[PDB]
Design a protein that fits this description.
It is classed as ribosome. This is part of a larger assembly, with chains A (92 residues) and B (165 residues). Chain A is 4% helix and 25% strand. Chain A is mainly beta. Classes of the chains: A mainly beta (92), B alpha+beta (165). Chain A binds two RNA strands through strand 1 and strand 2.
Chain lengths: 92, 165
Amino acid sequence: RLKKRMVGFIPKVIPRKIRNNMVALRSEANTGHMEGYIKTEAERLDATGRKLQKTMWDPVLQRYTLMKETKVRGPFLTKSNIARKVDFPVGA
Amino acid sequence: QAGSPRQKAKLFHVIPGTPVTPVEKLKEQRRRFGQDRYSRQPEYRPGRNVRMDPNTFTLYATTKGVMTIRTSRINPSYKWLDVEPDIQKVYRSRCMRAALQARGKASMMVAGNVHYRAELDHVTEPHWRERVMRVPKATERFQDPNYFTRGLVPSLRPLSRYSYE
RNA sequence: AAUCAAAGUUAUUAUUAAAUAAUAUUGAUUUUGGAUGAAUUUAAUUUUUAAUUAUAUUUUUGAAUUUUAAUUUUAUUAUUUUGAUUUAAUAUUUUUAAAAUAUUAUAUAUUUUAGAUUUAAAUUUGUUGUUUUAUAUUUAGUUUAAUGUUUAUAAAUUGAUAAUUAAUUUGUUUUAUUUUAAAGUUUUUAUGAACUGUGAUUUAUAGUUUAUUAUUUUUAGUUUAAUGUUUAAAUAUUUAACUAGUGAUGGCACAGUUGUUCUAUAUGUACCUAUAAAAAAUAGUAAAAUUAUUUUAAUUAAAUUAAUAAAUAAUUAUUAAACUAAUUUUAUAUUAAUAUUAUGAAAAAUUUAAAAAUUAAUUUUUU
RNA sequence: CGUUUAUUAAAUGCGUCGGUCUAAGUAUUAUAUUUAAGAUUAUUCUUGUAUAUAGAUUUUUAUUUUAAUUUUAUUAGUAGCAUAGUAAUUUAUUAACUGAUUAUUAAAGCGUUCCAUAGAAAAUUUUAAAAUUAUAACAAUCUAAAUAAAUAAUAAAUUAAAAUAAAAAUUUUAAAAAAAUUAAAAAAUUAAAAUAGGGCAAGUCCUACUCUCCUUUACAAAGAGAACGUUUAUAUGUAAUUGUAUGUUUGAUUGGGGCAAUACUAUAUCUAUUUAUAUAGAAAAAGAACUAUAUUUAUUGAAAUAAUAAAAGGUUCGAGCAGGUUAACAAGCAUUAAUACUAAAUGUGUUUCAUCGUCUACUUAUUGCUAAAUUAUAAUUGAUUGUUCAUCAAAAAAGCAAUUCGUUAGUUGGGUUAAAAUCGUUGUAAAGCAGAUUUGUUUAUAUAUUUAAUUUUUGUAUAUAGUUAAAAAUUAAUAU
């Protein structure tokens, strides 16, 4: 077709496309959930050297859990999201 | 220089004065984003039992009942949409009000008369201009917070300052 | 000056056409070779002269589709011996060839003159009979099934497993059709080098200027002009020009996505777009048409969108519907289901625009 | 010095030169080209193809190809030279849009340039038979009738004329209002034409190159103890013949809103996370990314190819637009076989001061209209040209400069069929007739606009009028 890049209303800026403006807040509870979130201007600019974090309803667990930011493209439950075993302070 | 799109029709989807269900858009207002900026003031602000949709400024009723427009007494440019829930309460009067005025026995000074409302308010509240024109001193607008702890004033509302009548 | 409306019958002669029918078939229209053969050779694992009972699957997501039907069992390639049967069609030639009304200074056939006039079809995108077709006579001239009677029974659902208190018809299984005429094209192979290219092909039948065998040039077939313009000619008459070819009108030789080219996209048999042959290409997206009088319910619309109109609303249409307060004891076309190749509204009232009309507008819009 | 389908600075051809070739032909040779011979010379500089190259690409310029935008030196230069122009000067002509000369910054000629140059095409001078203007001037051959009997075209006509208004159009109708047969000539109208000329739509064609894509025969890799043919892989070449190269308003725009009478052509203005649906991939729970004229179907961009076939519809107009002393005017869009401007011939209705009024011929260029020469110099509108030419404008025949990556595009010059038996109207004549012009209709027919000499030159004033006459422009005009 050609015309791969459109020219009517090329928008000045565009929030969704900016080095890390749209971020998948995947859950720290490694349930594989994610909630795509565009960092507002409060974090659009590098106000945060730290990787964004939020508390969001984890619909799988039905519990409010952490949401660590992460690139929106990628498998969300890799062999890196395995937590090292631990014996809880319960049990005999 | 350029082109332009056609202005959509933002008009009533019911007949004012007649009964109304909730799944009816009472009026599909111009969210007057002057040109897709983020500040507008709708023509018909929401009224009794009417709740405005935030996005498209369309008023949907919340309970089934007869609908009406209340033009503000101060400025006849700013209107509310009242839905009064009882449909029999108005039908069983209209069927009288229109049966009385047929026999010539109804009075035309009714509140609901369109051309009388200008005078109606003034028969009852003769200085209502001064009750809305009065400018409040910043002292009384923030009544002594201690009167709230001592309980004299039931609850301080500091932002509700404007008389919308 | 001048009109005047009107002749329907030849006369005479007899065994084809078309489909069909499931028996034959080494190439139809003289006598090969006629030295003795070498000269009369068409054969190969592919929808082929071999022609196949489903709607589910599966699939570049969108033209791709169903498997033995009874194993040699009959769906199988067909005529003389009823003018061979049947049904449809019907002529073709010979020689026929006809007829007695309306003025008297002038619009158009009616007798009694005056009244009377779009010729039609299309096209009118109401730039509203918009410059298109028709000489006439006759023949030939265009395919969507207007119907449901007894054996007899259907009807949904998840993404998927499954679930189906979920509520209900009809049908001895209904399929097939889809306009008509018309391109340039386009691909598939057969014919052509007698025209004309180029290859090759002729080794001295007239005149002449110059010392010269080179060279001026007699020059009646040819760079011009007149005539001709369906012409005597799909190129001729008269005429200007030019003319010196031991290097060329010419033995046979090259052929079509290609030959040849002293090259002009020129010619290769009288338009090179080669001919010839075989298709149903597309043509609704302003082409031309689309055959049957006397009838028996009306109207327009104008919005979402378009690498700009086959699609949607709205209208119109076919078929069908039920009577929610409002009034008279008035008056009311509202709908459903399907069918639908459409973007622009006289005179006003105004509104954009140099408009110099277009544009918005919205009531017209004749059987 | 030959040779050609629109016939020539077309293409040939000898020489020189560049490149190639020593296992098929002779390397002072034959292939493969670019130029053009003869005579002078043949300049400056490089970004890419080619060569050479080293796994390849990427790099990389002895010679060659193509290039030089301020290459521009030689050289000619208003020239087939993008406009500017009729270049400014000089001649030449009575008049110089001619042509030639000088020089010379030529929109961007240029070394294959320039000179030399013959019969060609121009420009002079000059002479001259074609019947060249003036100018008109039949000797010749080309009957009727009698006979044979074709063609284009054909809706009809009893109206066709004529005048006027129109309304969409050129007018043709409609309407009003007006009033003449058969025969032959003429071409004003009907369609006197053919067929060219446009531009638009959908369709197909054909050619071209850095960007699209196969069947592709080349290059490279690999495999065969590599005896050579094949198969692959990676590559994709305009050598490749596929398809795209738009749509809308005229050249920019394509989005979703809003203000402008809750009209909106794009009208006029602006805004902005107002968001780009599906399908394969990407994310596997409820959550998610990418991109397309942002309704979103296709796989590049360009050409005139003499482009075409089936259609309608305009350049030259009952109305528009931009560049002439500022402003009145040439004239790129709403009709429609009207089928180019000019000339020739031949008309016409207007309108324009005091009689009263409208005949100039030439030069250059055939563009058109002026400039300007003849003492003195053509009123302005309008309808006009199928009868006549073609000069212009003009359809791969070229070429120059110019734009193009190319195919090609636009200025300039040389080329380049322009045409049918006249049926209706129309009009000129005629109908053989006449012892006779004429009552009224109606009129192709009308004395002057290339100036003299008289005579009054006096009246008036610094020069001098006015009726007329002669001569000149030389010809006569009646249907019953």
